[PDB]
Design a protein around this ligand. Structure first.
Ligand SMILES: [Mg+2]
Ligand SMILES: [Mg+2]
Lengths: 126, 313
RNA sequence: AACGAGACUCUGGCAUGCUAACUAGUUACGCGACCCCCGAGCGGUCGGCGUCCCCCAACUUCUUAGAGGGACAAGUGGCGU
């Protein structure tokens, strides 16, 4: 059978997408002409294979981002999430509270307010 | 209340439907260019069990047919296909009367004069071309033209001093004096390539859309930019109204029709809603055409179908 | 990163779209002619057979051979981290 594309086709398609991301659509007969005009493919069969892998990649970039092509539109949605967001707030409630042998530890470095306690069953798995 | 209703559907094609054109002379015949290299002229039998039958298939083209337009008398058609050639047909038999050779790449658009005296064609050569009606090259816009694909060209309907307008893949709307064939003014904006362009029947506005998804209204007299409508997904074809102040827009799977008075959407023509079990759920919308009666619009899709939508009260 | 595989070259399949052809043809009738009624009819006019003869007829469907086009797992449904 075959129909397994080669690295020469996949790398070409990845570069074509990573540079001309906004000229490429979802149909094959237009991506063919786009790649024909932006690059120099010295064959027609290679042109069709590259333009056919470009379409299969485009159908995926509309979903979650692939891990070999980096574009501008899909980087902002990372960048603007790596900066803080109102889903997060501060430490969620600033009345966080501890158990004994920590208050016994905190006493040895002069702490004195806003805590709680509990004592467990006396050993693991009971 | 004015509403739209799905009257019927026309069948007979094999690929995408790319253009639909109606003439005000014969209200019972439609032209439909498709990607199966043929152009179907329909027998519009107004019944409701079906709605139309193909009457005759204008054949003879070596690739996709990108544009078609009917003459003013209804006896001729002009066509432009993806082999660079234009064809002048005879709506009575077929028998292409004249082929307009001369281009190096596919022919995207085609338009006919008000008196059917000049012809204009835009292609992927970044070349606008004017032709005599006998099949010879009148004039070529080689430079000061778009730097990319000239996606669409149109004539203004005005007898008052004449405009032609062209949109391209260089995100620009350029306007020309038809006598001189030089630039009149530019129009900047539209982040992304341009799919279509159109002129209102009063010859005063140009509604341009494209990849951006926003339809912009430009003024042909003031030389300014009136306003913008975010069309949502993407714009394939924009068409004005014959007897109303609307603007029909072909979005991806839907058709958005605005009342321009208060710039408000009237309707969202969505087809049936089967749970398409993966991927892009709907067949997208390519072209649309308003009937000279202003009562029904025809829409050509990407799934080989042509649907009708009637204005109901 | 390099070679080999693949890509590559020739070939077979498709174009009533282009280019253009008495050292290839088709159709038409100009024809003209032979033959038979084999049809209405008369046998003539209309037809039927012709690798019989002509056209400075119109054309490229069949023939030739160049340029481009066209297929990409592209479309749709399943199975796939
Ligand atoms: Mg390695
Ligand atoms: Mg699949």
């Amino acid at each position: 059978m075959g129909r397994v594309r080669t690295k020469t086709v996949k790398k070409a398609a990845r570069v074509i997408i990573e540079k001309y991301y906004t000229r490429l659509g979802n149909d094959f007969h237009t991506n063919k002409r786009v790649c024909e005009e932006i690059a120099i493919i010295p064959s027609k069969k290679l042109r069709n294979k590259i333009a056919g892998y470009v379409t299969h990649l485009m159908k995926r970039i509309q979903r979650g981002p692939v891990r070999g092509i980096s574009i501008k539109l899909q980087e902002e949605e990372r960048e603007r999430r790596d900066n803080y967001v109102p889903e997060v707030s501060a430490l969620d409630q600033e009345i966080i509270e501890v158990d004994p042998d920590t208050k016994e530890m905190l006493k040895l470095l002069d702490f004195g307010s806003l805590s709680n306690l509990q004592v467990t069953q006396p050993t693991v798995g009971m | 209340t004015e509403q739209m209703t799905l009257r019927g559907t026309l069948k007979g094609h094999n690929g995408w439907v790319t253009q639909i054109a109606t003439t005000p002379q014969f209200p019972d015949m439609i032209l439909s260019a498709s990607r199966d290299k043929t152009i179907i002229m329909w027998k519009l039998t107004r019944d409701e069990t079906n709605y139309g039958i193909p009457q005759r298939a204008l054949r003879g083209h070596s690739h996709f047919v990108s544009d078609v337009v009917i003459s003013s008398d209804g006896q001729f058609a002009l066509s432009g296909s993806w082999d660079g050639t234009l064809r002048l047909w005879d709506l009575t038999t077929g028998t292409t009367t004249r082929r307009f050779v001369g281009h190096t790449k596919d022919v995207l658009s085609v338009a006919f004069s008000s008196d059917n005296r000049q012809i204009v064609s835009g292609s992927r050569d970044k070349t606008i071309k004017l032709w005599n009606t006998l099949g010879v090259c009148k004039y070529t816009v080689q430079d000061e033209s778009h730097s990319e694909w000239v996606s669409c060209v149109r004539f203004s309907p005005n007898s008052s001093n004449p405009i032609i307008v062209s949109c391209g893949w260089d995100k620009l709307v350029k306007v020309w004096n038809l006598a001189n064939c030089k630039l009149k003014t530019n129009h900047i904006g539209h982040t992304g390539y341009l799919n279509t362009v159109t002129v209102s029947p009063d010859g005063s506005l140009c509604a341009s859309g494209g990849k951006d998804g926003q339809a912009m209204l430009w003024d042909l007299n003031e030389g300014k930019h009136l306003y913008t409508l975010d069309g949502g997904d993407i714009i394939n074809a924009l068409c004005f109204s014959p007897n109303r102040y609307w603007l029909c827009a072909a979005t991806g799977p839907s058709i958005k029709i605005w009342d321009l008075e208060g710039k408000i959407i009237v309707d969202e023509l969505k087809q049936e809603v089967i749970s398409t079990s993966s991927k892009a759920e709907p067949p997208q919308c390519t072209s649309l055409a308003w009937s000279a009666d202003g009562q029904t619009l025809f829409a050509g899709y990407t799934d080989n179908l042509v649907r009708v939508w009637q204005v109901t009260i």
